[PDB]
Enzyme design. Structure first.
Site, PDB file in Angstrom:
ATOM      1  N   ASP A  44      -3.025 119.949  11.713  1.00  0.00           N
ATOM      2  CA  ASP A  44      -2.705 120.730  12.912  1.00  0.00           C
ATOM      3  C   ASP A  44      -3.500 120.192  14.077  1.00  0.00           C
ATOM      4  OD1 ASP A  44      -1.459 123.348  14.094  1.00  0.00           O
ATOM      5  OD2 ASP A  44      -3.581 123.398  14.717  1.00  0.00           O
ATOM      6  N   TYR A  49      -7.134 119.830  22.365  1.00  0.00           N
ATOM      7  CA  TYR A  49      -8.305 119.561  21.525  1.00  0.00           C
ATOM      8  C   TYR A  49      -9.026 118.247  21.876  1.00  0.00           C
ATOM      9  CZ  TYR A  49      -5.982 123.189  18.726  1.00  0.00           C
ATOM     10  OH  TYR A  49      -5.343 124.339  18.307  1.00  0.00           O
ATOM     11  N   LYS A  78       0.982 120.640  19.903  1.00  0.00           N
ATOM     12  CA  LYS A  78       1.255 121.773  20.782  1.00  0.00           C
ATOM     13  C   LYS A  78       1.247 121.357  22.230  1.00  0.00           C
ATOM     14  CE  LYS A  78      -1.586 124.449  17.515  1.00  0.00           C
ATOM     15  NZ  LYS A  78      -2.714 123.546  17.264  1.00  0.00           N
ATOM     16  N   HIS A 111       2.003 126.240  22.921  1.00  0.00           N
ATOM     17  CA  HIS A 111       0.671 126.657  22.468  1.00  0.00           C
ATOM     18  C   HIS A 111       0.398 128.133  22.783  1.00  0.00           C
ATOM     19  CE1 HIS A 111      -3.542 124.729  21.613  1.00  0.00           C
ATOM     20  NE2 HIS A 111      -3.554 125.993  21.220  1.00  0.00           N
TER      21      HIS A 111
HETATM   22  N1  NAP Z   1      -2.560 128.076  18.115  1.00  0.00           N
HETATM   23  C1  NAP Z   1      -3.758 128.415  18.544  1.00  0.00           C
HETATM   24  O1  NAP Z   1      -3.933 129.046  19.735  1.00  0.00           O
HETATM   25  C2  NAP Z   1      -4.990 128.135  17.760  1.00  0.00           C
HETATM   26  C3  NAP Z   1      -6.151 128.870  18.034  1.00  0.00           C
HETATM   27  C4  NAP Z   1      -7.258 128.713  17.208  1.00  0.00           C
HETATM   28  C5  NAP Z   1      -7.170 127.813  16.148  1.00  0.00           C
HETATM   29  N2  NAP Z   1      -6.024 127.080  15.918  1.00  0.00           N
HETATM   30  C6  NAP Z   1      -5.933 126.100  14.799  1.00  0.00           C
HETATM   31  O2  NAP Z   1      -6.465 126.704  13.629  1.00  0.00           O
HETATM   32  C7  NAP Z   1      -7.564 125.915  13.162  1.00  0.00           C
HETATM   33  C8  NAP Z   1      -8.572 126.746  12.407  1.00  0.00           C
HETATM   34  O3  NAP Z   1      -9.165 127.705  13.241  1.00  0.00           O
HETATM   35  P1  NAP Z   1     -10.615 127.523  13.850  1.00  0.00           P
HETATM   36  O4  NAP Z   1     -10.904 126.094  14.118  1.00  0.00           O
HETATM   37  O5  NAP Z   1     -10.696 128.470  15.001  1.00  0.00           O
HETATM   38  O6  NAP Z   1     -11.673 128.099  12.777  1.00  0.00           O
HETATM   39  P2  NAP Z   1     -11.768 128.292  11.177  1.00  0.00           P
HETATM   40  O7  NAP Z   1     -10.944 127.344  10.450  1.00  0.00           O
HETATM   41  O8  NAP Z   1     -11.594 129.746  10.940  1.00  0.00           O
HETATM   42  O9  NAP Z   1     -13.332 128.019  11.006  1.00  0.00           O
HETATM   43  C9  NAP Z   1     -13.887 126.753  11.305  1.00  0.00           C
HETATM   44  C10 NAP Z   1     -15.400 126.863  11.127  1.00  0.00           C
HETATM   45  O10 NAP Z   1     -15.693 127.159   9.773  1.00  0.00           O
HETATM   46  C11 NAP Z   1     -16.511 126.151   9.204  1.00  0.00           C
HETATM   47  N3  NAP Z   1     -16.109 125.924   7.798  1.00  0.00           N
HETATM   48  C12 NAP Z   1     -14.953 125.340   7.363  1.00  0.00           C
HETATM   49  N4  NAP Z   1     -14.926 125.325   6.006  1.00  0.00           N
HETATM   50  C13 NAP Z   1     -16.055 125.953   5.590  1.00  0.00           C
HETATM   51  C14 NAP Z   1     -16.531 126.207   4.295  1.00  0.00           C
HETATM   52  N5  NAP Z   1     -15.778 125.922   3.230  1.00  0.00           N
HETATM   53  N6  NAP Z   1     -17.734 126.859   4.182  1.00  0.00           N
HETATM   54  C15 NAP Z   1     -18.450 127.242   5.296  1.00  0.00           C
HETATM   55  N7  NAP Z   1     -17.995 126.983   6.568  1.00  0.00           N
HETATM   56  C16 NAP Z   1     -16.809 126.333   6.694  1.00  0.00           C
HETATM   57  C17 NAP Z   1     -16.375 124.917  10.110  1.00  0.00           C
HETATM   58  O11 NAP Z   1     -17.537 124.109  10.053  1.00  0.00           O
HETATM   59  P3  NAP Z   1     -17.506 122.502  10.077  1.00  0.00           P
HETATM   60  O12 NAP Z   1     -16.290 122.027  10.799  1.00  0.00           O
HETATM   61  O13 NAP Z   1     -18.811 122.116  10.785  1.00  0.00           O
HETATM   62  O14 NAP Z   1     -17.539 122.035   8.640  1.00  0.00           O
HETATM   63  C18 NAP Z   1     -16.203 125.613  11.455  1.00  0.00           C
HETATM   64  O15 NAP Z   1     -17.438 126.018  12.000  1.00  0.00           O
HETATM   65  C19 NAP Z   1      -8.085 125.184  14.400  1.00  0.00           C
HETATM   66  O16 NAP Z   1      -8.965 124.110  14.160  1.00  0.00           O
HETATM   67  C20 NAP Z   1      -6.760 124.823  15.041  1.00  0.00           C
HETATM   68  O17 NAP Z   1      -6.217 123.659  14.413  1.00  0.00           O
HETATM   69  C21 NAP Z   1      -4.917 127.235  16.715  1.00  0.00           C
END
Ligand code: NAP
EC number: 1.1.1.21
Length: 316
Positions: A44, A49, A78, A111
């Site tokens: 994704d 980004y 997006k 997005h």
């Molecule tokens: N459409 C939208 O508006 C939108 C909005 C938000 C997000 N997104 C998408 O959704 C994705 C995921 O959401 P997100 O990035 O907000 O956050 P997330 O996936 O909920 O959390 C990411 C965080 O968790 C940590 N982490 C990952 N695996 C872990 C594990 N197994 N144990 C402990 N910590 C862990 C990562 O650390 P490290 O990376 O340092 O390992 C990072 O700090 C985004 O990257 C993006 O691609 C889309």
């Protein structure tokens, strides 16, 4: 647990993908390479980004190594809010395609439903701190997205952060050519999205759950905010299944027939997050996790609460 879900365009989408928001440019190439090696087949991405070039480098390395074929990957990106004007949509997609080094995207999402003034600034603000809107609307932007499918630039189009009224506007658009394939929304035990998921699934739209771990690296986190990964109730469910809290949080949406896209740039966590096909949460576990809902959003686009298309005034 089937590893892919059928979209309303006839393509199959892997239910687990790698997120890339907040993956720094110098670390995301390795992250994507490790993910593909581990078995991820869905990445994704987004223009906003600021790392798509580095994602592209990783995909290309793996294609050249013959670890995967292009048809085995599902690459999502997006359209950013500053490109909603009908005349800018194709150029934005093609910039993303160029950065990713791809001939096509498997899925391209609007997005957010809110269009912003065009320019180099991702968030053009007024003096009151509110975003400056563009003279755009959801339906005209959708028509421009449909043309990307017609020219073969993208295999599917969808939306992100749209409420059910906004989805319904597209579904009821006169002269609609393509229904949205996917609505990508925030979803986790503190924001369970029952009504919006029910709505989308009833219309044959696949829901992708973003921030499944609660985005603990989000730049605006405050000390009073709840923390999913620290919640002892979720830790206890993880202990029971001999898994980590993150693994429980990833499996949860999978059992709701959602796609889920946890983000990591840490090789060990990238691998851990993929080891979620070897256990099952119980019916009671699912009911319990659903009961933790508290209507809490990490992603509320607060600079846009006065925008005509702000999605979160509506119940769902
Ligand atoms: N459409 C939208 O508006 C939108 C909005 C938000 C997000 N997104 C998408 O959704 C994705 C995921 O959401 P997100 O990035 O907000 O956050 P997330 O996936 O909920 O959390 C990411 C965080 O968790 C940590 N982490 C990952 N695996 C872990 C594990 N197994 N144990 C402990 N910590 C862990 C990562 O650390 P490290 O990376 O340092 O390992 C990072 O700090 C985004 O990257 C993006 O691609 C889309």
């Amino acid at each position: 647990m089937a590893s892919r879900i059928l979209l309303n365009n006839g393509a199959k989408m892997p239910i687990l993908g790698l997120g890339t928001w907040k993956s720094p440019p110098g670390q995301v190439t390795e992250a994507v390479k490790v993910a593909i090696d581990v078995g991820y087949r869905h990445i994704d991405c987004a223009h906003v980004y600021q790392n798509e070039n580095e994602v592209g480098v990783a995909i290309q390395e793996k294609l050249r190594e013959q670890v995967v074929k292009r048809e085995e990957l599902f690459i999502v990106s997006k359209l950013w809010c500053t490109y909603h004007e009908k005349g800018l949509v194709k150029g934005a997609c093609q910039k993303t395609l160029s950065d990713l080094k791809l001939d096509y995207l498997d899925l391209y999402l609007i997005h957010w439903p809110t269009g912003f003034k065009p320019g180099k600034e991702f968030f053009p603000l007024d003096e009151s701190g509110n975003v400056v809107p563009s003279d755009t609307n959801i339906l005209d932007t959708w028509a421009a997205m449909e043309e990307l499918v017609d020219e073969g630039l993208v295999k599917a189009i969808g939306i992100s952060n749209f409420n059910h009224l906004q989805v319904e506007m597209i579904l009821n658009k006169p002269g609609l050519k393509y229904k949205p394939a996917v609505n990508q929304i925030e979803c986790h035990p503190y924001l369970t999205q029952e009504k919006l998921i029910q709505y989308c699934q009833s219309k044959g739209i696949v829901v992708t759950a973003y921030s499944p771990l609660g985005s603990p690296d989000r730049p605006w986190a405050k000390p009073e905010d709840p923390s999913l990964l620290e919640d002892p109730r979720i830790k206890a469910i993880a202990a029971k299944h001999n898994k980590t809290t993150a693994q429980v949080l990833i499996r949860f949406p999978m059992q709701r027939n959602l796609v889920v896209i946890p983000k990591s740039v840490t090789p060990e966590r990238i691998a851990e997050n993929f080891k979620v096909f070897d256990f099952e949460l119980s019916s009671q576990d699912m009911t319990t996790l659903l009961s933790y809902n508290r209507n809490w959003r990490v992603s509320a686009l607060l600079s846009c609460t006065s925008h005509k298309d702000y999605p979160f005034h509506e119940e769902f």
